Amino acid sequence: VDDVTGEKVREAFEQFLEDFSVQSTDTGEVEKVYRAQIEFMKIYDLNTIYIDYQHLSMRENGALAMAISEQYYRFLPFLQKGLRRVVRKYAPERVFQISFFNLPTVHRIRDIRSEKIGSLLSISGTVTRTSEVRPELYKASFTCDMCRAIVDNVEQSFKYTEPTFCPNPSCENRAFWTLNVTRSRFLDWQKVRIQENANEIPTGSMPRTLDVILRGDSVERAKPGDRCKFTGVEIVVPDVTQLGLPGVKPSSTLDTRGISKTSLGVRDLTYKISFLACHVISIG
Amino acid sequence: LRIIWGTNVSIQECTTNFRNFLMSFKYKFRKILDERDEELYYIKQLNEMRELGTSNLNLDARNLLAYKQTEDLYHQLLNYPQEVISIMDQTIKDCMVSLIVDNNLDYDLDEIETKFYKVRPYNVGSCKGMRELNPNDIDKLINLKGLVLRSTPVIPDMKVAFFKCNVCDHTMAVEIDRGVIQEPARCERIDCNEPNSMSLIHNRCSFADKQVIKLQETPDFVPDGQTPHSISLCVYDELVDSCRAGDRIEVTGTFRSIPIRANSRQRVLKSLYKTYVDVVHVKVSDKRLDVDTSTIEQELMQNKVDHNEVEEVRQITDQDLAKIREVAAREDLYSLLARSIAPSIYELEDVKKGILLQLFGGTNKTFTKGGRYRGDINILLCGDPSTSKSQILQYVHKITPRGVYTSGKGSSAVGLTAYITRDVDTKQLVLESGALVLSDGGVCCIDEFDKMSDSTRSVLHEVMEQQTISIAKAGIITTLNARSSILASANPIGSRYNPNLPVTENIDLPPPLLSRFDLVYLVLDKVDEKNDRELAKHLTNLYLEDKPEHISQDDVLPVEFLTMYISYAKEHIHPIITEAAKTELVRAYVGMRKMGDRITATTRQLESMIRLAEAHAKMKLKNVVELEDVQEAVRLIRSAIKDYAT
Amino acid sequence: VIIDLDDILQYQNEKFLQGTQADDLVSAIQQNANHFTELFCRAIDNNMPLPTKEIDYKDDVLDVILNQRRLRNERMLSDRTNEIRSENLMNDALREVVEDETELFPPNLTRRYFLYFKPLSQNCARRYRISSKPLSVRQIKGDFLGQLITVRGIITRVSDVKPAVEVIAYTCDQCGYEVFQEVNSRTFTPLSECTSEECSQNQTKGQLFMSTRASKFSAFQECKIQELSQQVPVGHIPRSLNIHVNGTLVRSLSPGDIVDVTGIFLPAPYTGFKALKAGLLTETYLEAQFVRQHK
Amino acid sequence: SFDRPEIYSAPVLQGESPNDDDNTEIIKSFKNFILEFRLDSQFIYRDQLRNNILVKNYSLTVNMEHLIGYNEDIYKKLSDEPSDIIPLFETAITQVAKRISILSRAQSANSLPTFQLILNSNANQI
Numbered sequence A: 001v002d003d004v005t006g007e008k009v010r011e012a013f014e015q016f017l018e019d020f021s022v023q024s025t026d027t028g029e030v031e032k033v034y035r036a037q038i039e040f041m042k043i044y045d046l047n048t049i050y051i052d053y054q055h056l057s058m059r060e061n062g063a064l065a066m067a068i069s070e071q072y073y074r075f076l077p078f079l080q081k082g083l084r085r086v087v088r089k090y091a092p093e094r095v096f097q098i099s100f101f102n103l104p105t106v107h108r109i110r111d112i113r114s115e116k117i118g119s120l121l122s123i124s125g126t127v128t129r130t131s132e133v134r135p136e137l138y139k140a141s142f143t144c145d146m147c148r149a150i151v152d153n154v155e156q157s158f159k160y161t162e163p164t165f166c167p168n169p170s171c172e173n174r175a176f177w178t179l180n181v182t183r184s185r186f187l188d189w190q191k192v193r194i195q196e197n198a199n200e201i202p203t204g205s206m207p208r209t210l211d212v213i214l215r216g217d218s219v220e221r222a223k224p225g226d227r228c229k230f231t232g233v234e235i236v237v238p239d240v241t242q243l244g245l246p247g248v249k250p251s252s253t254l255d256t257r258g259i260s261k262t263s264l265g266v267r268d269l270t271y272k273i274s275f276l277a278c279h280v281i282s283i284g
Numbered sequence B: 001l002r003i004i005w006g007t008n009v010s011i012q013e014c015t016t017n018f019r020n021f022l023m024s025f026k027y028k029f030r031k032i033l034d035e036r037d038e039e040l041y042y043i044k045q046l047n048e049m050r051e052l053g054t055s056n057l058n059l060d061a062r063n064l065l066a067y068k069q070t071e072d073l074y075h076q077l078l079n080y081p082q083e084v085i086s087i088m089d090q091t092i093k094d095c096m097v098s099l100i101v102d103n104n105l106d107y108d109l110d111e112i113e114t115k116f117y118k119v120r121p122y123n124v125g126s127c128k129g130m131r132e133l134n135p136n137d138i139d140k141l142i143n144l145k146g147l148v149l150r151s152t153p154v155i156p157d158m159k160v161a162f163f164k165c166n167v168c169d170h171t172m173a174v175e176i177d178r179g180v181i182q183e184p185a186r187c188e189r190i191d192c193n194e195p196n197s198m199s200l201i202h203n204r205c206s207f208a209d210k211q212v213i214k215l216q217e218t219p220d221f222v223p224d225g226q227t228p229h230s231i232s233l234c235v236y237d238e239l240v241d242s243c244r245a246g247d248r249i250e251v252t253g254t255f256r257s258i259p260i261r262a263n264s265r266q267r268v269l270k271s272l273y274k275t276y277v278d279v280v281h282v283k284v285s286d287k288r289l290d291v292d293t294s295t296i297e298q299e300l301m302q303n304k305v306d307h308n309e310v311e312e313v314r315q316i317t318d319q320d321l322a323k324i325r326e327v328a329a330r331e332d333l334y335s336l337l338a339r340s341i342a343p344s345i346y347e348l349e350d351v352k353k354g355i356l357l358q359l360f361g362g363t364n365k366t367f368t369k370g371g372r373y374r375g376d377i378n379i380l381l382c383g384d385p386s387t388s389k390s391q392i393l394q395y396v397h398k399i400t401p402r403g404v405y406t407s408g409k410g411s412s413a414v415g416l417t418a419y420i421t422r423d424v425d426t427k428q429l430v431l432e433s434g435a436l437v438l439s440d441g442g443v444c445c446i447d448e449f450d451k452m453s454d455s456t457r458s459v460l461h462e463v464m465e466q467q468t469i470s471i472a473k474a475g476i477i478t479t480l481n482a483r484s485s486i487l488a489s490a491n492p493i494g495s496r497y498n499p500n501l502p503v504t505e506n507i508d509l510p511p512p513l514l515s516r517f518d519l520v521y522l523v524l525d526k527v528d529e530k531n532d533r534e535l536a537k538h539l540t541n542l543y544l545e546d547k548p549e550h551i552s553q554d555d556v557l558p559v560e561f562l563t564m565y566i567s568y569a570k571e572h573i574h575p576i577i578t579e580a581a582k583t584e585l586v587r588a589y590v591g592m593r594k595m596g597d598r599i600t601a602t603t604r605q606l607e608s609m610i611r612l613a614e615a616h617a618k619m620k621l622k623n624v625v626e627l628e629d630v631q632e633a634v635r636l637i638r639s640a641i642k643d644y645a646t
Numbered sequence C: 001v002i003i004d005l006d007d008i009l010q011y012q013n014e015k016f017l018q019g020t021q022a023d024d025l026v027s028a029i030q031q032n033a034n035h036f037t038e039l040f041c042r043a044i045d046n047n048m049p050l051p052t053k054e055i056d057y058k059d060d061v062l063d064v065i066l067n068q069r070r071l072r073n074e075r076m077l078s079d080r081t082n083e084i085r086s087e088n089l090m091n092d093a094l095r096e097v098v099e100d101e102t103e104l105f106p107p108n109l110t111r112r113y114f115l116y117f118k119p120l121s122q123n124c125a126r127r128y129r130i131s132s133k134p135l136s137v138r139q140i141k142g143d144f145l146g147q148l149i150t151v152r153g154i155i156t157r158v159s160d161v162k163p164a165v166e167v168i169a170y171t172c173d174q175c176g177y178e179v180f181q182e183v184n185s186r187t188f189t190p191l192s193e194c195t196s197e198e199c200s201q202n203q204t205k206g207q208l209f210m211s212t213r214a215s216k217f218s219a220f221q222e223c224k225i226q227e228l229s230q231q232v233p234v235g236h237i238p239r240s241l242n243i244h245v246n247g248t249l250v251r252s253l254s255p256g257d258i259v260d261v262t263g264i265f266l267p268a269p270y271t272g273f274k275a276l277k278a279g280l281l282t283e284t285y286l287e288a289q290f291v292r293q294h295k
Numbered sequence D: 001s002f003d004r005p006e007i008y009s010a011p012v013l014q015g016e017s018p019n020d021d022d023n024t025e026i027i028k029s030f031k032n033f034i035l036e037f038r039l040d041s042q043f044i045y046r047d048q049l050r051n052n053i054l055v056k057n058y059s060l061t062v063n064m065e066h067l068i069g070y071n072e073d074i075y076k077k078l079s080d081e082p083s084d085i086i087p088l089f090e091t092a093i094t095q096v097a098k099r100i101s102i103l104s105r106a107q108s109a110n111s112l113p114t115f116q117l118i119l120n121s122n123a124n125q126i
Helices: A002-018 A034-044 A054-059 A073-090 B011-021 B028-033 B041-051 B062-066 B072-079 B081-100 B109-114 B298-302 B319-327 B333-339 B349-358 B389-399 B511-516 B530-546 B561-571 B579-593 B603-618 B630-642 C007-018 C026-032 C035-044 C062-086 C092-098 C122-128 D027-034 D045-054 D064-070 D073-080 D086-106
Strands: A122-127 A134-136 A187-195 A209-215 A227-229 A236-239 A270-273 B057-059 B119-121 B141-144 B147-151 B213-216 B230-233 B251-258 B274-277 B379-383 B421-423 B428-430 B443-446 B469-471 B478-480 B485-490 B519-523 C002-004 C116-118 C148-150 C154-156 C164-171 C209-218 C220-226 C240-246 C259-264 C290-293 D060-063 D117-120
Touching (some): A122 A209, B011 B072, B011 B081, B349 B379, B579 B630, C007 C026, C007 C122, C062 C092, D027 D045, D060 D064
Parallel strands (some): B379 B485, C002 C116
Antiparallel strands (some): A122 A187, A122 A227, A236 A270, B141 B251, C164 C209, C220 C240
């Protein structure tokens, strides 16, 4: 059902970019133009694609446009999987980033609420106090020493450690890592920290910070003291120091109305809105 | 009979009796008000809720007092907020259903019946302030006053959870309703065994909006010897971004009390609880003081239309608008309005008149690029003491919507902006707004303008000229505007002004900075005898018969016509100062330049004359200026000029 | 309720002259003075003229809570003697049966009031011939801990009034009980699954969470007495001594005054740095009972 | 240097009571079994108990075919897992034994241990 939903959008996406993409005549901007982007990528071997949103706004009469734009974080691996099968059809180790651009309506920092979680949004502000460039794992090779330790695995999502099930061989749940610091696939990311525009703030209060993470292609493209436009996906980061705010803040005491008898591993959770972006254009 | 365990309420009598309230209401609040439109309210306001699509009906409390019966439901409401508010929600929804069965084809009946309707009460008493409150009275409704310092960012709240596994994979979910979230250990796929790992994906679940606003109040009838105080309150979903930094707000809400952890490490919940407020309804506008502008508001006019909210602007009714167009036809409005400002102080009608013209300040013209011309005018007034300088400043401090009152030798260069500090409750570095950013749009006041430093008074060279402030230190490097209308005063060396001495000499200022101020008064005393009889007759007129009667003869004084007169004169007028007066205006300016060979005259006099002139044209409802009335706009400087001869 | 220490002494001279001998009670209060609030207050509660006025509608919330606790307590106590009496097989024995198989709200919780002593003058002690000699803060040796003394000085740094907890009331949601908990210390800890007699001895324990309209609060405010600076030796500096204040007596300590506080003098456990402790150093304070101002 | 706090309870509200026939409210059937039984034409267990209190025997004897006679489901419940259902019957007896003890002793003449049941059948000689 839901896998039929996401797979249905997946085949509609493969069907989308396989077909025509240029409506213009001989005076162009000729056909196709996506296959020129794949093959032009094949000659230089740089492993990204820049696709527009307006062309996808043309075709489906807005039906698929209202299907990626809301639950975007749900639809990474289906999209990236279908694009990988298009590549194995038309091309001969691959890490693909699908960075949209040219969105209709730009919001500020004040229009951020929490009903807009998951979606895409165009944020414009001012870069101040950038940081440096450091790696990140996201490709584990971690299993127990008794005996097999060759399992490629999870921690694409931030946990980090460790692998849980199908262990080890043979040391079962929850025997896990030692990890491996030589068998992985890394990439690099920095964390710039945007500050709100000077010609926008409601008279009268003070400017307001926000954090933002850049992975992959858009490293180093930011500039200290310049305006930017970003890309929307807007994740949630676990936070600590908001205790005694006052609450009432929830907690996660696990259930025991199952297991029959013959400890208190309860937790806290408090979350602050960060932002995650992949395309940086420096118009301003 | 049924009852609830904590209370004495019953669902039947509250429901049917409140239904019996919403069908009959015929101005019994006026029967208490003594009578000095016969159709009831909530059919009309329920239709205004109906066609416009807005939610959020709101009612008073005195209306629940005046009707008999349901004198009982008021005392049920003031004690037990949550349950009674839930009951009134349910019967409002069934009253909408009981309306829609009159015409049967109305608004696609399912969803508009499905949409949540809610109640916001206010005006529920004000007996004793925040200090007196015993811990007997934990959960009630409370009214407060006072301003607002800062505003925390947005923090979410879980309303729905979301779970998966790695086997193989099924995706059940769970709600909150009480304090905690339980999670299952097993299973899905197979359900039963194996007891697989149960993960939580925290990018898929629902959320809410929770904003914390810190407040400081002014609880009149003080418990002597009380000092000021600070409360922290915790607004919710719809009312997020309904409070800036600086407004004067009257709040309702429920007093609460929840313990806090110790050192974020153990479960030792410390005793000696912490208290806060849990707001329900925000009351920004008011009927006694002034009303906010519109050229400032336009960002939150551009917002707040997608989501239905509170009014932020005083609602101009229709009947008294005819009285506005009637009083505008009076000839003597130019001395009537200036006479009716401060009815307890009696001289200086040029000064009262200039203080009236500070409330009508200029025309806000914005260019394509650059420009940004405000309507700021700026007034000094000095002279001998014992001249009631302070009464004027307290009265203007009451009338102004966003006024901030500093003083001399209680200032610093830090003391007007960027109080970057350490907030205690969250233990981070939070930046505060100083004394001019709170003054943003409105009237500031400064006493003893002589006794500043050099560092202070070097702030005002930016605010008076550029109409900016440029903070540049370690927190934030970003300019931020503070439009404001500065009013000040100073006391000379004398203290009596003596003749045959230069006017610039007798007040210790550099005369370029004295030359930068628009309108400079010099109020001195007369040794003659004829006025003082009327003076003492005014004072003993005030002291007598222990009742406020002060001026009723032979004068008509509007009480609160003038505030809506000023606000209506502040939105719907754009005066333009076209061709026919430039001959007289440039002619008088070159005539002013003639004196040369004490004070001088620069281009600030010319900028002064156009902005003061069109400010006079803003009065009396004229979209253009005339060649006539520019003469007395010169004479407001010429009265001081006749006061410069001695 | 102000229970003075003059009516007791006059009662002892009256009973001493009537015959027989009366047991000495005033010095017995002055020596210990902590047991007698609970002993005295459970002496009050046997007899009380209950029904003298019907409840107002608009009275309060604390009244209506204690009224429902009292009424439910009665109906619970009558149900069991409506059950066992119909299973036969003077009636004092059946009362002793029913009164020990039924869990009840204890009378420490349905109280509504407080109780405060009041020390004796020099006038009444002069008429018939100590409990109130006005002492100074230097004079309080560490051998008065427990008695009922009297000081004088200038109040400085009186703080705000904020609620402090006394008993905390949970609900069980499955069994339906109300599990209380008393708190004596500075810091407490919340508790877990249940401790009843029904959610215990079962497999599936419930889970409990608290509520704030059924606990019992009390106002709380602390301040400091500095030495009067007239009763000092030649080369010294004024000291200080803390005061806790509970109950009705709150909001009567204005800063910068001259006051005569009379109260009892207890210990409260602390020592300072960990490397300075020798065991079992105690760090005293002064409870308040009755406040009399000069000026 | 204070003393310890205390924890207690009071039954106020009912209550999630289907009732699911679990560890308690089985004991309701045995307080209904010793007291509220009478075979024709005389109740037999109550008299044996109030007899056994005076001689201080502190025991009780049960016929098991009588248990399948009166009720039916607790019989096979007992024959499933007998090592965990018998001490429930012990507490079920001693709650009644306190009542009969105090009513007999106080009209008209601490401490009392837990009893024991001694059952006996003649069904099937395995």
